[PDB]
Write a protein that binds this ligand. Sequence first.
Ligand SMILES: Nc1ncnc2c1ncn2[C@@H]1O[C@H](COP(=O)(O)OP(=O)(O)OP(=O)(O)O)[C@@H](O)[C@H]1O
Ligand SMILES: Nc1ncnc2c1ncn2[C@@H]1O[C@H](COP(=O)(O)OP(=O)(O)OP(=O)(O)O)[C@@H](O)[C@H]1O
Ligand SMILES: Nc1ncnc2c1ncn2[C@@H]1O[C@H](COP(=O)(O)OP(=O)(O)OP(=O)(O)O)[C@@H](O)[C@H]1O
Ligand SMILES: Nc1ncnc2c1ncn2[C@@H]1O[C@H](COP(=O)(O)OP(=O)(O)OP(=O)(O)O)[C@@H](O)[C@H]1O
Ligand SMILES: Nc1ncnc2c1ncn2[C@@H]1O[C@H](COP(=O)(O)OP(=O)(O)OP(=O)(O)O)[C@@H](O)[C@H]1O
Lengths: 362, 362, 362, 362, 362
Amino acid sequence: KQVSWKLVTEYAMETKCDDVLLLLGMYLEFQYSFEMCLKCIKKEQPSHYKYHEKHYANAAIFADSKNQKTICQQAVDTVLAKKRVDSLQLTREQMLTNRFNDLLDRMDIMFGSTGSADIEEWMAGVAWLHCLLPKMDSVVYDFLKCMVYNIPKKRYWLFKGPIDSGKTTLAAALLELCGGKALNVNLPLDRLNFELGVAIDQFLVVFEDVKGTGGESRDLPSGQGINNLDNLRDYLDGSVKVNLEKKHLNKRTQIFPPGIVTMNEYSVPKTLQARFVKQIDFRPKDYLKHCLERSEFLLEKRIIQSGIALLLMLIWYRPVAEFAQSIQSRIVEWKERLDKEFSLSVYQKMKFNVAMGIGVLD
Amino acid sequence: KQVSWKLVTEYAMETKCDDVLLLLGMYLEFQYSFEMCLKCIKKEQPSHYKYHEKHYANAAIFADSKNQKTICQQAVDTVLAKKRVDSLQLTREQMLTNRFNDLLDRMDIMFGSTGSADIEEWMAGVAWLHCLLPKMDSVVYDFLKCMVYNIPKKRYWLFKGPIDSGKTTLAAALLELCGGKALNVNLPLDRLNFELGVAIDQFLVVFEDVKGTGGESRDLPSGQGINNLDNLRDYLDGSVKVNLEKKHLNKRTQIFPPGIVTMNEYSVPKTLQARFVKQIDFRPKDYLKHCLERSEFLLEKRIIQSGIALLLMLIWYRPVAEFAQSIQSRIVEWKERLDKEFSLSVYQKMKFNVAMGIGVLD
Amino acid sequence: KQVSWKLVTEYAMETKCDDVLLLLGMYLEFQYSFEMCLKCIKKEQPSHYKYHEKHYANAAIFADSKNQKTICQQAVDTVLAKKRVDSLQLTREQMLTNRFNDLLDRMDIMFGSTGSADIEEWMAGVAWLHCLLPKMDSVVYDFLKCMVYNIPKKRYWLFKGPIDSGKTTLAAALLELCGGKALNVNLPLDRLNFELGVAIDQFLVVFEDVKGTGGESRDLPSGQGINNLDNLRDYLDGSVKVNLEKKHLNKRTQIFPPGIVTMNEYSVPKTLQARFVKQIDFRPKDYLKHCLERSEFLLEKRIIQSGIALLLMLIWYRPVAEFAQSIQSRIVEWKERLDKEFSLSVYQKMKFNVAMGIGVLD
Amino acid sequence: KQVSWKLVTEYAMETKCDDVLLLLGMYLEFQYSFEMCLKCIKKEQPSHYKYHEKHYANAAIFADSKNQKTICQQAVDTVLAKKRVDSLQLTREQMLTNRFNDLLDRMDIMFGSTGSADIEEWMAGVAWLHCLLPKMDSVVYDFLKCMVYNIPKKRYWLFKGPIDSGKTTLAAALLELCGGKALNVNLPLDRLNFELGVAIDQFLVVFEDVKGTGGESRDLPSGQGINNLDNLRDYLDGSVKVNLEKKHLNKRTQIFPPGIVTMNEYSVPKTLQARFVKQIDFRPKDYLKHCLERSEFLLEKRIIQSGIALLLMLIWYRPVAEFAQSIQSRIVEWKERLDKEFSLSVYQKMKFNVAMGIGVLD
Amino acid sequence: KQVSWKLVTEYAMETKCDDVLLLLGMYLEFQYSFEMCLKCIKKEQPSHYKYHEKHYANAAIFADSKNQKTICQQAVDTVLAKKRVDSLQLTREQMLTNRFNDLLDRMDIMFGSTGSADIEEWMAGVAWLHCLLPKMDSVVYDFLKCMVYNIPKKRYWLFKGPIDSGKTTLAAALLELCGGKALNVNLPLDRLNFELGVAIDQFLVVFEDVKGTGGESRDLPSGQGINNLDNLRDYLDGSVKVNLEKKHLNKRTQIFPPGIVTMNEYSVPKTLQARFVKQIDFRPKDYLKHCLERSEFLLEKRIIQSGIALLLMLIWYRPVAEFAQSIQSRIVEWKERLDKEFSLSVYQKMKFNVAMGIGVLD
Ligand SMILES: Nc1ncnc2c1ncn2[C@@H]1O[C@H](COP(=O)(O)OP(=O)(O)OP(=O)(O)O)[C@@H](O)[C@H]1O
Ligand SMILES: Nc1ncnc2c1ncn2[C@@H]1O[C@H](COP(=O)(O)OP(=O)(O)OP(=O)(O)O)[C@@H](O)[C@H]1O
Ligand SMILES: Nc1ncnc2c1ncn2[C@@H]1O[C@H](COP(=O)(O)OP(=O)(O)OP(=O)(O)O)[C@@H](O)[C@H]1O
Ligand SMILES: Nc1ncnc2c1ncn2[C@@H]1O[C@H](COP(=O)(O)OP(=O)(O)OP(=O)(O)O)[C@@H](O)[C@H]1O
Ligand SMILES: Nc1ncnc2c1ncn2[C@@H]1O[C@H](COP(=O)(O)OP(=O)(O)OP(=O)(O)O)[C@@H](O)[C@H]1O
């Protein structure tokens, strides 16, 4: 019998796989007999053991085929086609709800019976994040609500401050909570066109550590980053559709997404200042360093920079009414789990431990 | 049986779709059973539920096909070919008539019983816009005339007020009324070839926020936009037919379209200044800002910016005789529908609120 | 039955069509029934209504086909091959005779009863053009004879003078009379290879708006242009074959065509000036301005730009015996028609109206 | 009969071969009759004599085939697909454990009776290396742990010092021990995008000899290398995923791997220094130089720069319990062999010979 | 019957022909009857007259075939695959032995019964070459050893001195002896990437006449070669594998080969001077110039350029025991032939003639 190109496409759609070689590689693993499959018996990775039994008969015939990459390319095109349909037609509030449902699905597995992490350590993460800025939950609620409402010329937030201040730490967490991509505009102007092509159909972008000019009085090395941005004003404004590049494509036309710009304390033009609706002054704090020096499980597990940590913070601090009505059911269950496995006295103690510069679990 | 490539091309033309992945993604939705289709039950997106039953049989066979992107590329080529044929053979009045018809069809959808907006909020839009310039209604009709008559040299309009003065606000609204593209002449002259190539077959160009030099005493930052335009004089003049580099292909030959140039108050070289038929001196108005600070639904819904708002202004103010003969059947229904929903005192009350800087609905 | 590729190729040849999306677009229009086609009844476009009845059968089978763009690419290459053979094997006098024959076919269609032009406005245009330069009729024949004779390094003419002087108007008219292309060598050496890549197999070239240096005391801005032309001497001399280049094709070695250079009062280096046969010293004339301010149909209809006005002038001022013996038959029918529809006193009145700077038709 | 593409794909995965021409050439060597094969009789290369008999019948039919390169491209893509699966799903400890197994398999071949290597020269290498820096086996273990844990912003080590200080020697041995790629960031910005794309799916990267500025007071020539690294800060930080590109590919998005930077005593910006967790200052030593003048075999055989030498140092110095549990059985077997063939006093005499700057084997 | 693709591949293997058009052209010449081929009867070209009679029957079916360039590309990729198997699996001693075998095969033809060359004139060349430097046969042997051992960093030789000193003459002779390529790193810093890509799988690389800066006090013009070479240090050192690229291929990772740098008397950085294991200063000398004015056959037949002359020099001067054991038996037969056809007094008279600046054969 022949290969079913449809059954491959189902696997690609269900695993949301948009890399041709990753799809090829995993579909090849299914060729071996399911009765003995060691990865299935060891339960190693979700995207194998769920699917092998359904796909085995087709994977065996796929392994003989002469067209293997042409099958996978069509299957990957289908996943990209789905994403472009969704990006035009869904409301941004529903896109965020779709993103949260995937993050809650991760949280089920990580803290599950087949779990691999401790919820007490991740809540220690929340306590460290709440110390970084005054009214941390208000800032994160403002950020979500801004990215959902997407008001013209009030679309970008500026994160400013000296070295090792936590601006990247917060940006990276927001960039996993919301789906998005990072962009580096410190490169020269003639490559900039392909670089900005990564924003195609993305919900959020982060421009990381934009180098300025006039840094020499502060010992900061100068560069063209700030000057490249001031050539891109209409990409920031979002009033008009802009023609985004891609390799092996024509220009493709859309509103370029909202985002975060991070920089050191350079000067900024008035023309560029008119685009940023909000500015966050990140401060180095000596006591926050002394905590991490004793509590390194946070960084080895990448806790304080993951989007799962901010979702746990929103589950703790915000009312249920500010989640969209469909996900309120799952959010309520998670509030009951955090009320079960902690107390307010432990959480108040954890914040005190961080502020004292001792170990959070002390 | 085989896929009908003809039926796919009918959907592509009926939905005016010229992106290959978008056509692919939407056509795959039709493979599911029509009797259960939740998107049809919700009547959510027009270009789904009008078509599913007509195309369902062909989508079941397309789902098994091994040629999916090959089919859709030819369907997209057919839509692109129609647009080129039109661009050579239609008169500019027919093009603008076909453009107004498309807008009017969207007005029927937005303000219907399946509607999503209130026509008062958009007539509030007309009241806000009419304050921005003296006699806005007549400046629009002069711009429309100029783009239809396309007289050599007498082709471009210059918008050159100070910062944050509404030049983008009017430019984006005129851009959607007529159809066109924004172009980035501030990017590098060795790739500007592939930027101007976006103007192939288009009706308007807007050259967004052209940077000059010599404004630095007034804090205006330097850039090369003005020097690039002063190299493109034959493109602006529109006497001769110029050569446009369509990406990955050899050049097209055509008259580069008319359009709007937006800039801050830099100096313009005398050689370039002659290319502009008329100039608009925008300014900040503090009362107009405070009106928006209260009437926030105007910004959130993009009401002050969409071409539907200028068309409602044209429907309200101008004599029916200024519109081409085939749309006069539609305009007069909308004139009756506008006089039905509004009194003149209410509209004067809107404009009075704008001049006082209070909310337009107050 | 099956698609016949010969029939598509014949349509492309007869319409002299060399763009693939344009050929695809028009041939698709023939798929509908001939008995009721509005386009065939309205007589809108010649290249439709002449051809639908012949091709209906093939266009119906073409709409079912899966190789549509493959057929059109071979058909366009047949038209491109024909231009290659002609430009290698014809004499330049026969090339110009072929070009005049094509323009007379337009004149038949324009002034025949299905057209829309008024010949009184075109002969007013002839009267207006003759005032732009002294002895204009001699100059056109001197330019034409130069392009037919093509003596080495005596191949280019220089159009020079103040801004707003009609040099582009006359150059664009002379271009349409001859054929040819415009090139903008103010675009950078970073891309200049593909710019001169437009001159392949052309009869005439216009280098538009060439920027010099050292014009600041005359308020002229500087640029690269004159240094690019003075780097391109091997192209302007035309003694030897030069390796012209266009993307996704090999270089083709040929003699680069002769042409017109348009510039303001920049300095021209002594090495470059030795490439020009003669210069024309344009300057503004006040009466020509006040004439166009009133005879405004000239600019709107582009009458002073079109080569049809220059050809109607050559019909008026030159002997029959300057034209080739194959075309003299048509020329005498047109010469009779201009006497039958005018008089000498009417033409004298038109020129005097231009000299008075009033409306030409008065 | 016909070619089995499955048998080629087995050989490609067996030999872990990812160059298409290399695979093609080696598989063609199997076409000749096995009964007489000179390379098999001579045992010259494992990847031949192990595999010829299994593959011969398929190679005989493959040698007739008209599609040979297409077959080999599918076989190579299957091997890149495997690596793409491993890099996303394995732990970094498993990756290193797998890599050590590959090196231990080479040691069995090198020091078998079929192999050419002499263990005394390779242990002479270990003695020399342990003199280059204090506590070398602690430094190596610390580095290996740092690469496994991959802690954000604590990922890169800086090797600094004079000319001929041994920093390249030690980096090359580490780079073989845990497989990675060397990158040249001294070339201009416009080629960096392709060059940085070599890091896709690699465990480790080394930036060799990055040129700075301000060296001229110390005879060191300036370059842009340090400025380029100061633009790439987010690649060094590794907090967020960056967009990496090959030629003729779309981008791959991943965390850019940990690494080593080697440089001479140019100044480092304070923004860049914060990315480096540990700096090693190398120094020239006369006894090491004079020793290498006498034990020339070390340099001819490339012993001091090979990862096998560092693995031998780890086997001799580190406890078994520091190695991963699944290879402790192999390490114990090698520890027994080393104590069987060396005393400590032989090795202490080797180190004394090195400190004396006489020949290691004296 | 059909084309045997295997027989075309055999011919490509036996002629080492790795150009697609050359293979196509030569194989097409076999289609004519071999009974009366004049190139065969005149024995004009070995790659023809040896092979025509075997391939005639296949060339007749090849001449009718429609896939001719597809057959040739597979045949050429088979030769390229053989080279890449060899460059990894052979020892560098075998590579040089294989190269010397190929030169000896030419020499037997050149000096055979169909020989166009005269061994007297070529040994006149050996006499001239041995005068260019002291102890030339030891310089040559020291070079060969250095290339065969390829010791890290001790890899490159520098040829330095005034114009017309013979440094290119010796580099070209050593390049034809070993095989390899010449690279011009004076070309711009971006084209440099594909220029260096020519080194893939090569044995030698020769960098020709690299420009320094700061020589205008001694009439030597500035350039960028020495600044570029100081950026390529990791390629010269050969400690690490480096990334090499060809157009429309991704990078090949290998140790960049050893060889020779030729330069006039510019100053060299300490950083680059540390890479060179030996420097030769060449001085212009009058007697060699006056000899060549009378010994003109040397330049015309390119005798002093040729690796055949250096091999003849090694056969004359060096012991047999220095050559590899498999080639030694051919070396003995060539030593006998030189002692037969030259006495010592003939050769010593030639060296006296060179010193006298008279004709070598005088
Ligand atoms: N506010 C803070 N005060 C002190 N230490 C901090 C703070 N925030 C983060 N850190 C420490 O500094 C490390 C780096 O933080 P991070 O990269 O987020 O800073 P950044 O200010 O965004 O840096 P950069 O300017 O280099 O982009 C963290 O891993 C943590 O150990
Ligand atoms: N005439 C005006 N007076 C005051 N505020 C204005 C005016 N026009 C627009 N606004 C406010 O300024 C915001 C930005 O308007 P807009 O982008 O059109 O200005 P611009 O002058 O074109 O900007 P830029 O200087 O950035 O090119 C609007 O969203 C509105 O809030
Ligand atoms: N000789 C003239 N005297 C006065 N007005 C003129 C003259 N020639 C042209 N014009 C006016 O100037 C407009 C522009 O003409 P055109 O583009 O041919 O001028 P040009 O001198 O070639 O231009 P440029 O200075 O940009 O090279 C015309 O449409 C007409 O209205
Ligand atoms: N510590 C040392 N002391 C003396 N000589 C050394 C030392 N280390 C290496 N060498 C010698 O110098 C040669 C080059 O070593 P290597 O290339 O590793 O040095 P490096 O300091 O990294 O060089 P560079 O500054 O040129 O990049 C070695 O082959 C060895 O002969
Ligand atoms: N040692 C020498 N003394 C004088 N003339 C020489 C010497 N060697 C070669 N010649 C003459 O100089 C000519 C050029 O030699 P060659 O090109 O090898 O010199 P070069 O020093 O490498 O030159 P350049 O500096 O131009 O690269 C030879 O063909 C020969 O005629």
